[PDB]
């Protein structure tokens, strides 16, 4: 932690495919910035009617977060499982596994970094929520929270079971008393258990994928990391954003307001939020 937070924001925004987005990231109280993001409206080479947005919360360095931000989408869309809902979901799963294996082979990783990843792939008919770690995506529809991804915490029943089966333990709500997420990309020190596949390791790169039919009543999706969700609940943040959209249509601005509000509520983390309005 710094003595004084770096409150400078990086912002971006864009529009297309019947969406508008804004985003904001801030280093905040932490000594390093290790978050990254992806915002693609109109996926090229065939997926022009689709969009993808993601937030990556890095730890023990930026290297994994940064690489995901510019390569995960490629890994998802170009594998043989991706190339129907079934196939999209498998393609996403395959992309996560292949990037985790690929990154492992870089000279610096053979660097101890890891990253969460949360995203949405938006098609003309479906939203695919994607989660790996304790970042979170939430959908607001018809004036209510409609959907939330499930945070991957070591204390969760099935996460604890896998961890125990891999010879670890959950102590102080952390993997072997150190890692505060039970799923992530990178973190290779937690993926060296003999006799276990990639998805059976102390920390798993397997994402959970939730597909949701799109509705005319869809209002917005929020993607943010635990530095936001730590101080605001799903309903609390949705209602906040809703109240801000009442006075501003500048999504960068709205996102900056969210981030500053969470800082004032005491969040000492790096923070990244992406707001996608329909």
State which H helix or E strand residue 165 sits in: helix 157-165
Q: At what angle do helices 63-77 and 85-104 cross, to 10 degrees?
A: 140
For Mg ion, the closer of residues 29 and 129 by Cβ is 29
CB of 121 to Mg ion, least distance (A): 23
Burial class from Cβ neighbours inside 10 Å (0-12, 13-18, 19+) for residue 264 reads: exposed
The tokens for 161 are: 């079971």
For Mg ion, the closer of residues 218 and 226 by Cβ is 226
How far apart, in whole angstroms, are the C-alpha atoms of residue 190 and residue 208? 19
Burial class from Cβ neighbours inside 10 Å (0-12, 13-18, 19+) for residue 180 reads: middle
CB of 155 to Mg ion, least distance (A): 17
For Mg ion, the closer of residues 13 and 268 by Cβ is 268
CB of 32 to Mg ion, least distance (A): 11
For Mg ion, the closer of residues 36 and 277 by Cβ is 36
Cβ proximity of 268 and 213 under 8 Å = no
For Mg ion, the closer of residues 51 and 116 by Cβ is 116
CB of 225 to Mg ion, least distance (A): 4
Q: Cβ neighbours of residue 247 under 8 Å, at least 6 residues apart?
A: none
For Mg ion, the closer of residues 88 and 181 by Cβ is 181
DSSP state letters, 197-229:
-GGGSSSB-PPEEEEEE--TTEEEEEEE-HHHH
For Mg ion, the closer of residues 205 and 227 by Cβ is 227
CB of 270 to Mg ion, least distance (A): 6
Please choose, from the candidates 17, 248, 207, 251, the residue with its C-alpha nearest in 3D space to the C-alpha of residue 115.
207
CB of 35 to Mg ion, least distance (A): 7
For Mg ion, the closer of residues 30 and 244 by Cβ is 30
The tokens for 163 are: 């961890």
| 204 HSE (CA, 13 A, CB side) | 23
Cβ proximity of 43 and 52 under 8 Å = yes
Name the one residue in this structure whose structure tokens are 């204390």: 155
CB of 211 to Mg ion, least distance (A): 26
- List of residues contacting Mg ion (CB under 5 A): 57, 225-227, 269
CB of 142 to Mg ion, least distance (A): 30
Please choose, from the candidates 3, 1, 4, 276, the residue with its C-alpha nearest in 3D space to the C-alpha of residue 141.
276
């Amino acid at each position: 932690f710094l003595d004084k937070p770096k409150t400078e924001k990086h912002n971006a925004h864009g529009a297309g495919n019947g969406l508008r987005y804004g985003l904001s990231s801030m280093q905040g109280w932490r000594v390093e910035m290790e978050d990254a993001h992806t915002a693609v409206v109109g996926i090229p080479h065939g997926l022009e009617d689709w969009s993808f947005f993601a937030v990556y919360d890095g730890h023990a360095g930026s290297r994994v977060a940064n690489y995901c931000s510019t390569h995960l989408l490629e890994h998802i869309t170009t594998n043989e499982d991706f190339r129907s809902v079934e196939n999209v979901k498998n393609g996403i799963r395959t992309g996560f596994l292949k990037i985790d294996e690929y990154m492992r082979n870089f000279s610096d990783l053979r660097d101890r970094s890891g990253s969460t990843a949360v995203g949405v792939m938006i098609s003309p008919k479906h939203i695919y929520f994607i989660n790996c770690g304790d970042s979170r995506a939430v959908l607001y529809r018809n004036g209510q929270v409609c959907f939330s991804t499930q945070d991957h915490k070591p204390c969760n029943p099935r996460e604890k079971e896998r961890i125990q089966n891999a010879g670890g333990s959950v102590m102080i709500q952390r993997v072997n008393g150190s890692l505060a997420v039970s799923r992530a990309l990178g973190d290779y020190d937690y993926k060296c258990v003999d006799g276990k596949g990639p998805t059976e390791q102390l920390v798993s790169p397997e994402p959970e994928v939730y597909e949701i039919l799109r509705a005319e009543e869809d209002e917005f999706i929020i993607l943010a990391c635990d530095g936001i969700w730590d101080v605001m609940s799903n309903e609390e943040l949705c209602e906040y954003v809703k109240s801000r959209l009442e006075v501003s249509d500048d999504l960068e601005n709205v996102c900056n307001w969210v981030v500053d509000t969470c800082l004032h509520k005491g969040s000492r983390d790096n923070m990244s939020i992406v707001l996608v309005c329909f």
